[PDB]
Design an enzyme around this catalytic site. Structure first.
Site, mmCIF file in Angstrom:
data_model
loop_
_atom_site.group_PDB
_atom_site.id
_atom_site.type_symbol
_atom_site.label_atom_id
_atom_site.label_comp_id
_atom_site.label_asym_id
_atom_site.label_seq_id
_atom_site.Cartn_x
_atom_site.Cartn_y
_atom_site.Cartn_z
ATOM 1 N N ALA B 6 0.815 -1.234 0.087
ATOM 2 C CA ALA B 6 -0.118 -0.008 -0.101
ATOM 3 C C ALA B 6 0.797 1.185 0.051
ATOM 4 O O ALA B 6 1.348 1.677 0.989
ATOM 5 C CB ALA B 6 -0.916 0.141 1.300
ATOM 6 N N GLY B 7 1.306 1.559 -1.061
ATOM 7 C CA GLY B 7 2.225 2.692 -1.437
ATOM 8 C C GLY B 7 1.700 4.182 -1.408
ATOM 9 O O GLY B 7 0.384 4.199 -0.975
ATOM 10 N N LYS B 12 -0.728 -2.085 -4.726
ATOM 11 C CA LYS B 12 -0.559 -3.415 -5.494
ATOM 12 C C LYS B 12 -0.651 -4.492 -4.729
ATOM 13 O O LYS B 12 -0.383 -4.653 -3.456
ATOM 14 C CB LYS B 12 1.113 -3.424 -5.623
ATOM 15 C CG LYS B 12 1.545 -2.422 -6.842
ATOM 16 C CD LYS B 12 1.639 -0.926 -6.381
ATOM 17 C CE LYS B 12 2.659 -0.581 -5.123
ATOM 18 N NZ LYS B 12 2.608 0.974 -4.931
ATOM 19 N N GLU B 66 9.133 -2.300 3.636
ATOM 20 C CA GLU B 66 9.037 -2.273 2.368
ATOM 21 C C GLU B 66 10.364 -2.529 1.687
ATOM 22 O O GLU B 66 10.452 -3.015 0.580
ATOM 23 C CB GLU B 66 8.382 -0.992 1.758
ATOM 24 C CG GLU B 66 9.147 0.483 1.621
ATOM 25 C CD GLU B 66 8.367 1.682 1.158
ATOM 26 O OE1 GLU B 66 8.601 1.791 -0.153
ATOM 27 O OE2 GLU B 66 7.681 2.461 1.650
ATOM 28 N N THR B 95 6.146 6.784 -6.032
ATOM 29 C CA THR B 95 5.933 8.221 -5.793
ATOM 30 C C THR B 95 7.279 8.839 -5.849
ATOM 31 O O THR B 95 7.195 10.249 -6.251
ATOM 32 C CB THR B 95 5.017 8.117 -4.522
ATOM 33 O OG1 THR B 95 3.597 7.473 -4.805
ATOM 34 C CG2 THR B 95 4.577 9.881 -4.329
ATOM 35 N N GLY B 118 5.493 10.847 -8.449
ATOM 36 C CA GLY B 118 4.813 11.756 -8.006
ATOM 37 C C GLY B 118 5.060 13.033 -8.741
ATOM 38 O O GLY B 118 4.146 14.236 -8.989
ATOM 39 N N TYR B 133 -3.694 9.983 -15.597
ATOM 40 C CA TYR B 133 -2.320 9.327 -15.426
ATOM 41 C C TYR B 133 -1.943 8.879 -17.046
ATOM 42 O O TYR B 133 -1.191 9.120 -17.449
ATOM 43 C CB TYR B 133 -1.911 8.252 -14.751
ATOM 44 C CG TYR B 133 -0.666 7.763 -14.756
ATOM 45 C CD1 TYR B 133 0.152 8.413 -14.264
ATOM 46 C CD2 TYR B 133 -0.528 6.536 -15.380
ATOM 47 C CE1 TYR B 133 1.561 7.647 -14.679
ATOM 48 C CE2 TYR B 133 0.816 6.093 -15.712
ATOM 49 C CZ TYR B 133 1.864 6.646 -15.082
ATOM 50 O OH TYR B 133 2.973 6.100 -15.257
HETATM 51 N N1 ADP Z 1 -2.765 3.855 -12.935
HETATM 52 C C1 ADP Z 1 -1.983 4.728 -12.273
HETATM 53 N N2 ADP Z 1 -2.702 5.742 -11.645
HETATM 54 C C2 ADP Z 1 -1.741 6.862 -11.105
HETATM 55 N N3 ADP Z 1 -0.250 6.592 -10.949
HETATM 56 C C3 ADP Z 1 0.325 5.626 -11.902
HETATM 57 C C4 ADP Z 1 -0.516 4.668 -12.515
HETATM 58 N N4 ADP Z 1 0.176 3.729 -13.189
HETATM 59 C C5 ADP Z 1 1.597 4.260 -13.057
HETATM 60 N N5 ADP Z 1 1.666 5.382 -12.130
HETATM 61 C C6 ADP Z 1 2.707 6.021 -11.638
HETATM 62 O O1 ADP Z 1 3.564 5.207 -10.665
HETATM 63 C C7 ADP Z 1 3.722 6.054 -9.713
HETATM 64 C C8 ADP Z 1 3.703 5.245 -8.469
HETATM 65 O O2 ADP Z 1 4.647 4.275 -8.410
HETATM 66 P P1 ADP Z 1 4.644 3.016 -7.394
HETATM 67 O O3 ADP Z 1 5.677 2.207 -7.462
HETATM 68 O O4 ADP Z 1 3.248 2.229 -7.077
HETATM 69 O O5 ADP Z 1 4.757 3.973 -5.800
HETATM 70 P P2 ADP Z 1 3.988 3.691 -4.571
HETATM 71 O O6 ADP Z 1 4.557 2.627 -4.116
HETATM 72 O O7 ADP Z 1 4.572 5.261 -3.830
HETATM 73 O O8 ADP Z 1 2.333 3.925 -4.756
HETATM 74 C C9 ADP Z 1 2.740 7.053 -9.727
HETATM 75 O O9 ADP Z 1 3.228 8.281 -9.194
HETATM 76 C C10 ADP Z 1 2.840 7.330 -11.180
HETATM 77 O O10 ADP Z 1 3.882 8.164 -11.821
HETATM 78 C C1 N7E Z 2 13.665 17.644 3.649
HETATM 79 O O1 N7E Z 2 13.981 16.898 2.711
HETATM 80 C C2 N7E Z 2 15.410 17.064 2.196
HETATM 81 C C3 N7E Z 2 15.424 16.218 0.739
HETATM 82 C C4 N7E Z 2 15.351 14.763 0.820
HETATM 83 C C5 N7E Z 2 15.830 13.949 -0.212
HETATM 84 C C6 N7E Z 2 15.808 12.595 -0.219
HETATM 85 N N1 N7E Z 2 14.397 11.914 -0.145
HETATM 86 C C7 N7E Z 2 14.513 10.709 0.104
HETATM 87 O O2 N7E Z 2 15.381 9.713 0.235
HETATM 88 C C8 N7E Z 2 13.060 10.227 -0.037
HETATM 89 C C9 N7E Z 2 12.665 9.506 -1.261
HETATM 90 N N2 N7E Z 2 11.453 8.771 -1.504
HETATM 91 C C10 N7E Z 2 11.632 7.470 -0.878
HETATM 92 O O3 N7E Z 2 12.393 7.038 -0.710
HETATM 93 C C11 N7E Z 2 10.022 6.691 -1.275
HETATM 94 O O4 N7E Z 2 9.195 7.594 -1.826
HETATM 95 C C12 N7E Z 2 9.639 6.360 0.197
HETATM 96 C C13 N7E Z 2 9.505 7.633 1.100
HETATM 97 C C14 N7E Z 2 10.494 4.983 0.754
HETATM 98 C C15 N7E Z 2 8.245 5.832 0.154
HETATM 99 O O5 N7E Z 2 7.976 4.782 -0.771
HETATM 100 P P1 N7E Z 2 7.077 4.617 -2.117
HETATM 101 O O6 N7E Z 2 5.753 5.024 -1.837
HETATM 102 O O7 N7E Z 2 7.283 3.381 -2.720
HETATM 103 O O8 N7E Z 2 7.752 6.086 -3.126
HETATM 104 MG MG MG Z 3 6.266 1.940 -3.235
#
Ligand code: ADP
Ligand code: N7E
Ligand code: MG
Ligand code: ADP
Ligand code: N7E
Ligand code: MG
EC number: 2.7.1.33
Lengths: 269, 269
Positions: B6-7, B12, B66, B95, B118, B133
């Protein structure tokens, strides 16, 4: 003599006490006009647009590669300003960003990235229609990134996260959670500066770790009139256990280095 | 059992042959509705929003971090797909982007950056007003970055540059040189994908060099419906002397890993 670092956006000019001047690279013809009004025996040139100056004026010129010129000028400025560093990364945040490891004797380029001052201006224009650099940077300073950027804490919520919650998780990743927000020019520009600063810093701290130095010296004109950028970079550098250094007139490192290299190019055996 | 990652943007879901499903994180209540219609004895959860699912349903649940879940699932998928890699970086482009070194036995996080999916969505929305998207990514595919991005060759012009001329020098750094251009939604979005891809890749190749591996495995949903992003990343990885790998269902690595970790959590001594 005169040292000139004719870069992608700004032409930095050093006259020798030093006198510092800048001109826009787009106004390179006006630098040539200025030169033609001086009494200059030799140009010491560096930067991508050095060849354009050299081919457009009759004053003898010698060209130096920017990486060695920047390193040499920076080493001079650091000592003038009381820093005796054994080694350091330097990050030259110009139109784009070039990263170097200085081992105490010489520099090597260890990376680079297109996130720099050019992106601030260009992406800033796309988001705000501001072309004037002072206006753009002034507008950004007090922008609120909170409706634009997603932090780790926003994803993990009530679960303790695996990395610190205050870190940016996704630049611009909060926009879709705030679709009814007023995305003000200030807020958008602050987020542009945020991503540039965070990317540059991330790369700098990574190569600092790789090359086993705690020191990171930041130069480039991208910091000029941009206290927000300086703070984003300083704060994250400190958070990641490194020591950030800014340098008075550091954006003129290449120009100073060109003068120095010209002077010591003369030798015999 | 069911594995759920659950990201920040997508949930997924893996059902066991595998059945793969996604749902938007914003629609997490609909995942709970779906779960309540199944005959599931245990949830194997991971990701930032795992706790939200667990607290909202009466099915027994176990949560896994994760990074270890993603590494384990990815290792399973790589072997299923014929790769026997001794070591590798993996870049989880979700993201946001998380970077890991897998030494053959376990993973360690070696960096991360907020340039990821993101940012594609959020900055893409600011530049195009597209929230869908598929529409956003489809629009970007054939965009022309040439009036937006500055290459090294544009700065150095007729002088041979110190690094290859085709490299991006400054993302969005050509905008101010093309102020009368039609900055089409496609062109702008291609440049957003360009900067994200180049930053992720730059960081991946840098930590690949630091940890002495030539292999870089790219996972995350950010590649879905985004062939341009895959090409930006593949091409630059190859240019920098590393071997890029994409993985069928790689975005489900965490979900697969959660199921695997749950299964082998049972032992005694
Ligand atoms: N159906 C969709 N809806 C929204 N975003 C999507 C979709 N398919 C792919 N993405 C892309 O994938 C990203 C999320 O990747 P993902 O690995 O699932 O991240 P998280 O674990 O943070 O949810 C989104 O930010 C977007 O760029
Ligand atoms: C104040 O911030 C200063 C700059 C920070 C830059 C570095 N940032 C990071 O390393 C975080 C990047 N993001 C991630 O690692 C991932 O998005 C996670 C926070 C682990 C979450 O996972 P997911 O939902 O799969 O993207
Ligand atoms: Mg993820
Ligand atoms: N007066 C100015 N006009 C335009 N850009 C400026 C000015 N002052 C600072 N900058 C910033 O500095 C950047 C250029 O940095 P600099 O180190 O001079 O690069 P270069 O060597 O490529 O010219 C610009 O992209 C912009 O962000
Ligand atoms: C095709 O491109 C793929 C991605 C390339 C990413 C890496 N790019 C780089 O390393 C170039 C970054 N830019 C720089 O190093 C500088 O802007 C220079 C080109 C040295 C010019 O110097 P300056 O004018 O002072 O910015
Ligand atoms: Mg420069």
């Amino acid at each position: 003599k005169v040292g000139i670092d004719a870069g992608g956006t700004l032409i930095k000019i050093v006259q020798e006490q030093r006198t510092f001047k800048t001109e826009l690279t787009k106004n390179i013809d006006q630098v040539v006009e200025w030169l033609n009004q001086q009494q200059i025996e030799k140009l010491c040139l560096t930067g991508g647009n050095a060849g354009v100056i050299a081919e457009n004026i009759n004053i003898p010129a010698q060209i130096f590669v920017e990486f060695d010129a920047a390193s040499q000028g920076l080493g001079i400025l650091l000592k003038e300003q009381g820093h005796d560093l054994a080694d350091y990364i330097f990050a030259n945040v110009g139109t784009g960003t070039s990263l170097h490891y200085f081992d105490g004797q010489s520099q090597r380029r260890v990376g680079g990235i297109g996130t720099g001052g050019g992106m601030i201006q260009g992406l800033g224009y796309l988001l705000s229609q501001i072309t004037d650099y002072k206006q753009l940077t002034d507008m950004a300073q007090h922008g609120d990134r909170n409706t634009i950027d997603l932090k780790v804490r926003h994803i993990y919520k009530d679960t303790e996260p695996p990395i610190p919650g205050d870190l940016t998780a996704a630049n611009f990743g909060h926009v879709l959670h705030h679709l009814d927000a007023d995305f003000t020019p200030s807020n958008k520009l602050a987020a542009v500066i945020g991503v540039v600063g965070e990317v540059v810093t991330t790369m700098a701290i990574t190569v600092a770790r790789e090359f086993k130095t705690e020191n990171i010296v930041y130069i480039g004109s991208s910091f000029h009139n941009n206290a927000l950028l300086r703070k984003v970079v300083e704060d994250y550098t400190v958070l990641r256990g490194c020591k950030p250094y800014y340098v008075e007139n550091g954006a003129f490192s290449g120009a100073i280095g060109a003068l120095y290299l010209e002077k010591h190019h003369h030798h015999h055996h």
